[PDB]
Amino acid sequence: TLHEFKKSAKTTLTKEDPLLKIKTKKVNSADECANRCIRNRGFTFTCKAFVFDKSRKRCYWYPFNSMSSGVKKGFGHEFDLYENKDYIRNCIIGKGGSYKGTVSITKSGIKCQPWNSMIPHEHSFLPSSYRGKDLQENYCRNPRGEEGGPWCFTSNPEVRYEVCDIPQCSEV
Amino acid sequence: TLHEFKKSAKTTLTKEDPLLKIKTKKVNSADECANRCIRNRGFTFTCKAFVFDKSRKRCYWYPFNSMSSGVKKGFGHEFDLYENKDYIRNCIIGKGGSYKGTVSITKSGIKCQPWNSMIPHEHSFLPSSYRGKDLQENYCRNPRGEEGGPWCFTSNPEVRYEVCDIPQCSEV
């Protein structure tokens, strides 16, 4: 059930104003948080993401994600951000230089290679460089904002990289 | 695992051109089809949807969904369309009169009432009327193309309907 979310390790969301309260609860695991954000149990809002305090074992169910306005994202090795994929835009806007979706299969069905891995191919596209371009796992991303759109390094030794078949919002 | 798809009962996809082949396989259940479209097993394309022939127990893995161009959708009581949610636009374009996402919680956390149900409230918004507006299950839809955007009939007897908190593609 935690599979239906997008984890951002050691990350927490912060916003700005006083008008915001954060529904929390002493939970047993991060799964409990998730199986309640999904089924929107006792919420007076629409849960789009939640943060799990690993040290206190507490959840903080939010009505927005790291992508909302005014929404910043703090650091902490005891926190874990989890965002409902239902609320992370799945289509591209242009060359999709701001794509944050979990797609990780190239236009022709080849699984992607982790950005934090140098096999099968070696590259310069590290998470430590393109910070903010979200080069997590093996997601389809576009660091340089190239024309092709989201792409990734193929796990097929015969293919360096390749574009990903991700829909335009103003499609075809 | 079939939960990570959007079923459209007794429906099949048809396209137009000759240049298209359809990967199929004699499968045991519709789950088998799904657990292979998801993990893109032996595909030379990106599976966005699949159709299960209940009578032949065969899958047809497609590289597009009912939303692609040239793509039509036939009828048959032995067929079942299943579309990867990853490829069904989750954001709104305007008043979102063409929204086909699986969201079904109102802006304030109230679960939605099935369009094919007359409880708690009675209405005229039937699937038989607004055909093409996809008034399936209890999804957030906008039949009349109103200003508010996607909405639905609340399951709370105290609330007739209410808007759903669904993101704009050119958000905020």
Side-chain angles (χ1 to χ4, degrees), chain B residues 16-48:
Chain B
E16 45 154 301
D17 70 74
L19 297 165
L20 265 71
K21 44 69 185 175
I22 300 303
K23 197 173 203 304
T24 89
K25 179 171 181 175
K26 190 72 175 182
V27 143
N28 207 64
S29 61
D31 305 65
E32 327 226 299
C33 302
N35 298 193
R36 184 166 172 181
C37 177
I38 289 302
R39 52 176 50 178
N40 254 71
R41 280 300 87 164
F43 303 162
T44 53
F45 58 94
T46 312
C47 181
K48 299 187 179 52

Side-chain angles (χ1 to χ4, degrees), chain B residues 60-131:
Chain B
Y60 302 80
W61 292 289
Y62 302 125
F64 53 70
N65 55 28
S66 71
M67 294 146 231
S68 298
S69 53
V71 165
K72 322 151 186 173
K73 62 194 300 176
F75 172 76
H77 58 285
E78 69 274 50
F79 306 123
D80 268 315
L81 176 46
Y82 287 97
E83 298 153 294
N84 197 322
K85 296 179 178 179
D86 240 55
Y87 296 98
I88 300 172
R89 180 154 47 63
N90 55 355
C91 54
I92 290 171
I93 299 178
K95 322 297 175 180
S98 61
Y99 181 63
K100 303 285 193 298
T102 56
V103 179
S104 53
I105 303 168
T106 69
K107 196 193 171 195
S108 65
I110 323 178
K111 180 188 175 180
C112 295
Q113 168 206 311
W115 301 95
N116 237 314
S117 182
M118 292 295 267
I119 309 177
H121 325 70
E122 299 199 66
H123 59 296
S124 74
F125 299 94
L126 267 147
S128 54
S129 308
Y130 307 88
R131 235 305 71 195

Side-chain angles (χ1 to χ4, degrees), chain A residues 26-41:
Chain A
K26 191 71 176 182
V27 143
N28 207 63
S29 60
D31 305 65
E32 327 228 298
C33 304
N35 299 192
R36 185 167 172 179
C37 178
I38 288 302
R39 52 175 52 178
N40 252 70
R41 280 300 86 163

